[PDB]
Subunit: 448 residues, 4 copies
C-alpha cells in the first residue's frame, strides 16, 4: 500500500493498529490482489497507532505463555487460506514450517504469534503512523454553511514531541482495544499495578530477582493465573499470594459445541436477537472467556500446590498460597516500610492481613474509550440517543439528515453487547476484516 500525504482527504482513517486494524489492512490488501480477487486507484488509507512500533499486549508476554486459540484462526486463513498473510505462510517464509509441524500443536507461544502479527504489520509500514495517540474526532462540513456533515477530522498527539496533527477522512474506524479496569476501592500506588503493565513496570519496581519479596495477585482469570505462576519462576525466593472472590479457579470452556459461538457465521445469529436474548446469551456462555483459566495451567498450578503439601502439610507455611472467597477491604500504604498492608475479609454477603511489596491487579479491561474520542460527534446521533448503536456491519447509527451517506464511523472490538463474545477476540478477525473492507470500500471495489 502507498502512503497518502497528511493534507489529503482520506477514504479511511483507522485509530489503532492492533490485531483488529491489522486484519482490515490484510483484508484490503487481499481484496486488491488480482491473484486472490478476480475483480482487482488505491484507496487513501492511514492507520494511527500510539505505540512506537507494532506490539501485542507486551506487558503480558509471560515466558512460556501460549495462545488460547487455534493458529487456523489467524488474521487471514478463515477468510482465505491462499492469503500470503496466513500463519502457515509466515512459518514457511521464516523457514520454520516443518519444525512447527513436528510440535503437533494448534497453540503457538504468544511470543511466536506476536512475531507473526509483527511480520504481517511490517508490510503496511507505509500506511501506519506510529507514535500517534488519537485525542479526538471532529465533524466536518465541506459546505460550512450547510447542515450536512461529510467528513471527519482526526487529531492525534505525537507521543515524543507532544505535537498535534490533523488528518481528514470520509470514514473512521475506531479499533483501540481496552483500557485497564481497576477496582474502585483500591488507592493509587506505584506498588499497585494492573496486569497489563506486568512485564513492563513490575521489574522496575522490584529490581532484584533474588530477594524474598511478598507479592499479591488479585483476580481469578487467565491473567491472574499466568502472573501467579510466572512470579514463582521470575522471583524464586518470593512469597506469592493469589487473592480471589470466587471459591476456585475455573476452567475455560473450549468444548466443541459450546465453542461454535465463536464461529464467524454466528455473528449474524447473535446480532439478530433482541437486547434481552443477547444479554441472556452472554451470561450463558460466560465460562468461555470471562474470569476463566486454561485447564492445563490450572492443573500445573494445582500440581505445584500439591508439591508444597508433600514438603510441608501446614498450608500456612507455604511459599505460595491461594486465598479463595476473599475481598480487599483496606490497603495501608502510607507506612514507613517498603510493604503495603492488605486487609482481607470474606467475599460472602451478610479475616487475615497481608504485607506485600507489590499487588498485581488482574481485573480485566474497560472498552468504553471510544466515547471520549467521539464526544464532539455525539450530536450527529439520532435525537435523544445517548449511546452509540453499531449496525451489523459495525457502522454506528447517525442521523441521515445530519450526515452524508459517504461519511461514517465504524467501531471494532468494543461491540460484545451487539455482536457476541468473539468481538474482542482474535476469533473472527479474518472474516470481519473482509466484511469491513466491503462495508467501507464496497462502492469503490464494485467499480473494478
Amino acid at each position: 500500500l502507498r502512503s497518502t500525504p497528511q493534507d489529503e482527504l482520506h477514504d479511511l482513517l483507522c485509530v489503532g493498529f492492533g490485531p483488529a486494524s491489522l486484519a482490515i489492512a490484510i483484508a484490503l490488501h487481499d481484496a486488491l490482489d488480482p491473484r486472490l480477487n478476480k475483480s482487482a486507484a488505491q484507496p487513501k488509507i492511514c492507520f494511527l497507532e500510539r505505540q512506537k512500533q507494532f506490539a501485542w499486549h507486551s506487558g503480558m508476554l509471560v515466558p512460556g505463555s501460549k495462545m488460547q486459540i487455534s493458529f487456523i484462526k489467524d488474521l487471514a486463513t478463515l477468510r482465505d487460506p491462499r492469503s500470503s498473510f496466513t500463519f502457515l505462510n509466515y512459518l514457511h517464509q521464516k523457514g520454520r514450517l516443518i519444525h512447527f509441524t513436528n510440535l503437533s500443536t494448534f497453540l503457538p507461544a504468544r511470543l511466536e504469534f506476536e512475531d507473526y502479527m509483527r511480520w504481517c504489520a511490517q508490510q503496511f509500514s507505509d500506511v501506519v503512523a506510529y507514535g500517534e495517540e488519537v485525542v479526538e474526532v471532529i465533524p466536518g462540513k465541506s459546505d460550512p454553511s450547510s447542515s450536512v456533515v461529510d467528513f471527519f477530522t482526526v487529531r492525534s498527539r505525537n507521543v515524543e514531541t507532544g505535537e498535534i496533527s490533523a488528518r481528514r477522512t470520509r470514514k473512521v474506524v475506531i479499533a483501540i482495544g481496552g483500557t485497564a479496569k481497576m477496582p474502585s476501592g483500591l488507592p493509587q500506588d506505584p506498588r499497585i499495578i494492573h496486569s497489563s503493565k506486568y512485564c513492563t513496570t513490575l521489574p522496575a519496581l522490584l529490581k532484584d530477582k533474588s530477594k524474598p519479596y511478598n507479592i499479591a495477585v488479585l483476580g481469578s482469570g487467565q491473567s491472574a493465573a499466568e502472573i501467579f505462576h510466572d512470579l514463582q519462576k521470575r522471583y524464586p525466593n518470593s512469597r506469592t499470594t493469589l487473592i480471589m472472590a470466587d471459591s476456585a479457579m475455573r476452567p475455560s470452556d473450549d468444548s466443541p459445541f459450546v465453542n461454535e459461538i465463536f464461529n464467524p457465521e454466528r455473528v449474524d445469529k447473535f446480532y439478530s436477537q433482541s437486547a434481552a436474548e443477547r444479554q441472556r446469551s452472554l451470561l450463558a456462555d460466560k465460562a468461555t472467556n470471562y474470569s476463566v483459566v486454561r485447564l492445563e495451567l490450572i492443573e500445573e498450578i494445582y500440581n505445584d500446590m500439591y508439591l508444597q503439601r508433600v514438603k510441608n502439610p501446614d498450608e500456612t507455611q507455604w511459599q505460595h498460597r491461594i486465598l479463595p472467597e476473599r475481598k480487599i477491604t483496606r490497603v495501608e500504604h502510607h507506612g514507613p516500610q517498603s510493604r503495603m498492608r492488605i486487609h482481607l475479609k470474606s467475599s460472602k454477603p451478610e479475616k487475615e492481613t497481608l504485607e506485600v511489596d507489590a499487588l498485581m491487579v488482574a481485573t480485566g479491561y474497560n472498552r468504553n474509550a471510544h466515547e471520549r474520542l467521539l464526544s464532539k460527534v455525539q450530536h450527529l446521533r439520532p435525537t435523544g440517543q445517548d449511546q452509540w448503536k453499531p449496525h451489523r456491519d459495525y457502522r454506528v447509527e447517525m442521523d441521515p439528515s445530519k450526515v452524508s451517506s459517504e461519511a461514517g464511523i465504524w467501531l471494532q472490538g468494543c461491540n460484545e453487547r451487539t455482536h457476541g463474545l468473539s468481538d474482542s477476540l482474535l476469533s473472527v478477525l479474518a472474516v470481519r476484516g473482509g466484511e469491513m473492507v466491503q462495508s467501507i470500500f464496497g462502492e469503490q471495489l464494485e467499480r473494478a
Copy 2:
C-alpha cells in the same frame, strides 16, 4: 455378619441396598475387624432391597460406559486403604490387578465397577433381604400407655408374593436413591421412556435392531448424551434426534480446585453455612454434576456429527441430529401409526415436527421418596416443622420429648441441600459409611 430373625428387635434397619447402604455395611464390617480396628456381640442389622439381587443402575449400563470418578473413590479406600473392600483388592481377588494397571486409567467401565460392588455386596447376603420393597415406617412405643416413641416398625411388600412383613428396630436408615423425574407436560405412553429404563424396556418396545426407527432423546446431561450415542450403535439404521432446551451440550467440571468440593472433609464446611450461602454455593458449582457431559463423550459425538458433514453438507439430511434451544409443546400419540408426533418450539421466552417410534427422556431424578415412607412418623418432628431436617450426622431432628435418645431415623443420598453436591454421588461414601457407623453404633463400639 450373622442374620437376625425377623421377630427380633434390630439395632439398625436399612432401607435400600445400593452403594450408600453397601458403604455402611462395609464400614461396619471394618469397624468390627480386629485387623483394622484395635478396639474390636454383633449388632442386629438388616438391609431391605426391592431388587431381587444387587444391581447398580442396570437400565443405564450402556455398552462402553465409563465411571466419572477415580477408582480411589471406591467404597472403602478413602476411609481405609487396608480394607478388604477396596477396588484394588477386588481386582487382586479376581486375578486382574496387573492387567488393570496396564490400562493406565482411573476410570473403570461402569460394568466393571458394578461387578466390584456386586462382589462387595455378596459378602453381606446373610443380612440383606432382597425382593423387599419398604412401604412404610411406623412409630412404636415399648410402653404403649406412655407418650415416648422408642422403636420403629418397618413394613415391606414382597415383590414376588405381595406379602407384607414387619420388622422392628431402634434405628432406621433410608438410602433409597432417586425416582424418575418426568416433565409434567408429557403424556403417559409406552413409547415415552425415562433414561433409567433404557437398557431394560426400550429393546422390548423396539425389538428389531435392524429397522429404521425414528428415536428422539430429550435432555442435555450425561444420560442424554450416552443414550444418544449408544442408539447409533444399537440401532445402526435408526434416525436419532437429541432435543435440548440449552444451546449446547456442556462439559462437566472436573478441574482440580473446583473438584475439591467433593472432598469428604468439605461436608463439614458446607453443612455449617447458612441456608442462603448453601443455596448460592450449589448454583455456583452446578457445572460439576448437573446437566453436564464428560468432555471425552462430547468430543466423540461432535466428531460423529463432523463425519456426517463430510458425507453430506446438508444438516437436514443427517441420520443423527441435535436440535438445540427447543422445547416440546405437544405430543400426538393417539394416531393409527406406530409413531408419535412431537411438536417443537423455541426454548426462548417471549418450529418443526418430529415423528418418532420412541422418546427417551433423560431429565434426572427426584429425591423425595422418603417423604411417603415417613408419613406416619411426621408428627414426631418439632411442632410446626413441615420438612425433615437432617443433622450433620444425617439423623433427622425429632422432638426430644416424643422420641427416646436410643431411637432415630437417618437419611442418605437425598441431602444435597444441607450436605452438598457430593451427597447423592459415590464421592464420599467410604468416609460417610465410617461416620454413619459411629453415629449409629457409637455407644456399642465404645464399650469394646
Copy 3:
C-alpha cells in the same frame, strides 16, 4: 491443464495417478500459476491410471480409520501454503473449515483425506486417462538408423475393452506404488485375502454380517490391527484371531526428534550417505513405519481385550484373541467344509489349530513392479548394471552414449533404499512434486 492428442509426442507421461503423481500435477499447476510463480506454451502431459476413477487404498478405507500424518503434510502446503491445493483451502471450498478447526485434530479420517485428494485430482481430468493399465515402456529412436534413444513408447491396456494404446514421450515417470506381498508358504485360495482387498473382496466372500464366522488375521502392523479391530464391529458375532510372529503389537515412533527423518530437507542428507550407512539408518528407524501400530489403536484393542477378561477370566473362551509368537506351518483348504484348517507353531527358532472361514493377510507390499514395465529399456543402463540406479532427482542412470539428454525415466515411491523412509509415504510429496517439475520441465520453465 489442456489435453494432448494420443498421437503427439508428449513432454511427460506419468504411469499411475495416485498421491505421488497427483503431487507432480499440482506442483506443475503451481509452477505455471502467475499468482504463485513470478516466472509464469503448456507442456504436453498425460497421466495413465488403471483404476476407473481416482481412489486411494479403497480396500483399506476402514470405518473410523485415521491419517497417520499431520494435514500440514498435504499435497501442497510444505511447498507453498498459498497454493489452492492445500487441505485448508479444500475445507474452505467445501464450507467445512471452521467445523474442522473445532475438532482440534491434525489427523483427518482417511475418508476425508481421500476426498481431499479426489477434489484435487478432479481438477486434472483433462490430462488423466483412467482405465489404462500400463504394460510396457519401449525405447524409441527418432533416427532408427542411429544408436541413440531419444523417446519412449508407453503401451497401456484398456481395462474395459482390453485394447492396447501407444503414447510417445521424451520423459517417463513411474509412480505405481506397491503390489500385495504374500508369504511364499501360503497356498492360493479365495478365503485367503490380502489386506489391500479387505473392503473390496471380503464382504463378497462373507455376505451375512450376522453369522458366527471364524476369521484370522496374519500380521502385526497397522493394517493387521485396523482389520482385527474392524472385524469385531463389522461381524459382531464373529470369532477373530490375530496371528503374529512378534511377541506384541509395537507402537509407531512419532516422537519429534526421530520424526525429523521425514523432513523434506533430510532426503539430501540420506541420499548422500554410502550404501552401508543407508542400510544401517533404515534399520535404526524401522519403528517409525514398518510393522508398527498407532498407539491410540493399540490402547483401544488392549482395552477391548481387558473388557473380555472382565467378562471371562479364561482367555481360551474369548470371542476375540491374539496369538503372539506364532507362525503358520500348514493350511488345510481342500476339505468338504466352508472352513480352512490353519496349523500353527512357535515363531521361535530351534502348537494349536484354527478353523477359519477367511484369513486376512496383512504382510505389506512389494515395490518392484517397475522392473516388469522397464524390461525392454534395461539394455540402456550402463554396461553390467543389473539394477535401476536413481539419481537424487529420481532420474534413473542411463548410458549417455545410448540415450539423449532430453530423454529419461524417473521413479517415484519405490526409492526407500536411496532416498529414505519417507519415499513411499505422503510425508515429502509436496516438496518432491516441486523438485520433480524442476528436474523434468526445468529448461522449459527457465525460458519463461
Copy 4:
C-alpha cells in the same frame, strides 16, 4: 521387627537396604502379620546399608522428576493391596490421599516416591545397620574339620570410623544395585562426573548458579535428558550441549502389550527360555528401559529447542544444543584454564571442538559388584563354573557336597540375563519380596 545382637548367628543377612531389600523386609513383615496371613519366634534378620540413612538415587533427585511406573507397582500392592505398606496407605497416613486423587496421575514425583519408601524404611530401623559398607562374604564351617560349609561371615566397614565388623548368618542376600559405568576412553577428572553424582557433586564444582558455564552431557537415555533439561533451569545463563552417538533421543515403550513383559508372572516364562532365546528377547524389548526417554520429556525438550529457533534461526548460536551422531575422541584437561577441551568425531564407522567447565556422563550402570564381595565363596560353585548361576528363586547354585542345604546366597537386582528386564526395576519388587520370603524362610513359616 526386633533386633539381633551382632554376635548371634542370623537366619538372614541382607547386603544393601535399597528398594529391593526393603521389599523383602516389607514382605517378611506381612508374612508375619496375623491380619494378612492366617498362618502367623521372629527370624534373626539384619540389613546392612552403606548410606547413613535411607535414600533412593539422591544424586538424581532432579527438581520436577517423575516416576516412570504406576504407583500401583509400589513395594506391596501387587502382592497384597491390604498391606499397610502400599502407596495409598502411605498417603492416607500423611493426610494426603484425597489431594493426590485430585491430581489424576499414576506417576508421583520421584521426591514423593522416595519419601514413601523412606516412610516404609523407617519402620525397620531396629533391623537395619546404616553406615555399614559390606566388603566381603566368607564361607564358614560349624565343624572346621569337615568339608561342609553351613554358614557365612559378612564383614563390613563402618563408613565413619573405618572399623571392621563381622556378622554370621546361614543365608545371605546381595541387593546392592549398580555401580557407575564410565566409558573407558575418558580420563579421570573432577570436571567429569557420572549422572549418579549430579545433585551431589556438580553444585560443589560449579558453585555460582548465575555464571555462564559451558556444560556438556554425554548420553541419550532418561538420565541424560533429565540432566540436560534441568541444567537449563539450574544454571539459567549456562551453555549446555547434549552429546550422543545415536541420531536422536528415542521414546520409552510403555504401550500396554509390550509392557506386559514387566508383569510379575512373566518372570517364570522368561526364566524357562534357553540362553539364546533370553538373549534375543532382551534385545527385542530394549526400547522399554534402555537408552530411552519418557515421551513427555522428549516433547518438552523439543519444544524448548523450537523456542530457540523462533528467537534465532541459526542453530550454531543457540544457548542449548544437541549434537547427534557424535563420539568423544579426545579430552584435553591439563590446560591452564577452568575449561576442558572436548574433541568430537562422527559416531559412524569407516568434527567440532567444545570447551566445557563440566562434563556430565549419563552412561548407565554396571551390575557386577557382587563378584568382588563373593570372591572367597567362588570355590563352592560346581567345579569349572566361572559365573554365578541364580535359580528361579534367586539362590545361586552351589556344590551340594560342599554346602549345607540350610546355607545359601541369593542375588537381587543383577539378574536381568536370567530373570528379564524387570529385574533391576521396581516393577516386580512387591511380588518378588513375597517369593524371597518363601524361598528363605519357607520351612520356618511352614511350622506355623
